[PDB]
Amino acid sequence: TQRLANFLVHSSNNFGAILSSTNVGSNTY
Amino acid sequence: TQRLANFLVHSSNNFGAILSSTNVGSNTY
Amino acid sequence: TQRLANFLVHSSNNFGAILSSTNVGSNTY
Amino acid sequence: KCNTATCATQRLANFLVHSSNNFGAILSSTNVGSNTY
Amino acid sequence: KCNTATCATQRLANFLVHSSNNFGAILSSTNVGSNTY
Amino acid sequence: KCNTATCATQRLANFLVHSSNNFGAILSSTNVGSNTY
Amino acid sequence: TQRLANFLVHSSNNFGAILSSTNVGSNTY
Amino acid sequence: TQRLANFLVHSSNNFGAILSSTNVGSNTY
Amino acid sequence: TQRLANFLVHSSNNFGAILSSTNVGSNTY
Amino acid sequence: KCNTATCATQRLANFLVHSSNNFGAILSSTNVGSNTY
Amino acid sequence: KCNTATCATQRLANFLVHSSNNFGAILSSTNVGSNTY
Amino acid sequence: KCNTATCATQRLANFLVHSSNNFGAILSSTNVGSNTY
Numbered sequence A, B, C, G, H, I: 001t002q003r004l005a006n007f008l009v010h011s012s013n014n015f016g017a018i019l020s021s022t023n024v025g026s027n028t029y
Numbered sequence D, E, F, J, K, L: 001k002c003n004t005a006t007c008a009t010q011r012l013a014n015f016l017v018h019s020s021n022n023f024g025a026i027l028s029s030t031n032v033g034s035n036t037y
Helices: none
Strands: A001-013 A019-022 B003-016 B016-025 C003-013 C018-024 D007-011 D017-020 D025-027 D031-032 E007-011 E017-020 E025-027 E029-032 F007-011 F015-018 F024-027 F030-032 G002-014 G018-024 H001-013 H018-024 I002-014 I018-024 J007-012 J017-020 J025-027 J030-032 K006-011 K017-020 K025-027 K030-032 L006-012 L015-020 L025-027 L030-032
Touching: C003 D007, I002 J007
Parallel strands: A001 B003, A019 B016, B003 C003, B016 C018, D007 E007, D017 E017, D025 E025, D031 E029, E007 F007, E017 F015, E025 F024, E029 F030, G002 H001, G018 H018, H001 I002, H018 I018, J007 K006, J017 K017, J025 K025, J030 K030, K006 L006, K017 L015, K025 L025, K030 L030
Antiparallel strands: none
């Protein structure tokens, strides 16, 4: 038997500046 | 028997400056 | 029998400056 | 609570109190990525 | 609580209190990535 | 609490108190990555 | 006396690939 | 007396690949 | 007397690959 | 030519000969800035 | 040429001969800035 | 040429001959800045 359960809680709170720059394969020239 | 359970809580709080720059394969010129 | 359980809590709080620059394969020129 | 076996309980405590009582002057300047030319 | 066997309980304590009571002048300047030319 | 065997309990204590009571002048300058030309 | 003369000849010839990217103040995110 | 004369000849020829990337003040994120 | 003369000849020829990346003040993140 | 004084003559020689006589197969691929995903 | 004084003559010689006579197969691949994902 | 004084003549010689006679197979691969993922 397989009793699998994923409890994924992703809480994110911001009260200031965020500069989240993600470059997956980006090529700047 | 397999009793598997993943309790993943990812809490992130910000009150200031964040510059999260992730370059997965990025190539700057 | 396998009784596996992962309790992963990832709490991160910021009150100041953060410059998190991660370069996984990035090539700067 | 748990009696027989295989007992796992995790308790998380998080009383974050961010109190800022400004009775005066605050001159802040947040510049993330800016560039003054 | 747990009686027989396989007893794991984890307790996390987090009373974070960030108190800032400014009765005067604060001249802050946060520059993350900025460049003054 | 645990009676028979296999007893593991972990307790974490975290009373962080960051108190900053400025009754005067603070001239701060945080420059992370900045470059003044 | 001032006898000033500027002989400025700017000759440019191309027979192949050129990628001339000039960023005077440009800010890529 | 001032006898000034500037003979500026700027000849450039290309027969292949050129990637001339100049960043005067450019800020990549 | 001032007899000044500038003979500036700037000849550049290419037959292959060139990657001329100049960063005067550029800040990569 | 110049006889008395202040004699400056500059001669530039430029016989560039780019000759390419392909009697066979040339498989070239110029990729400047391209990105094959 | 120049007789009295202040004699400056500069001669530049440039016989560049780029000859490429391909009687066979050339498999070239110029990749400047490219990125094969 | 120059007779009296102040004699400066500079001669530059440049017979560059780049000859490439390929009677066979050339497998070249120029990768400047490329990144094969």
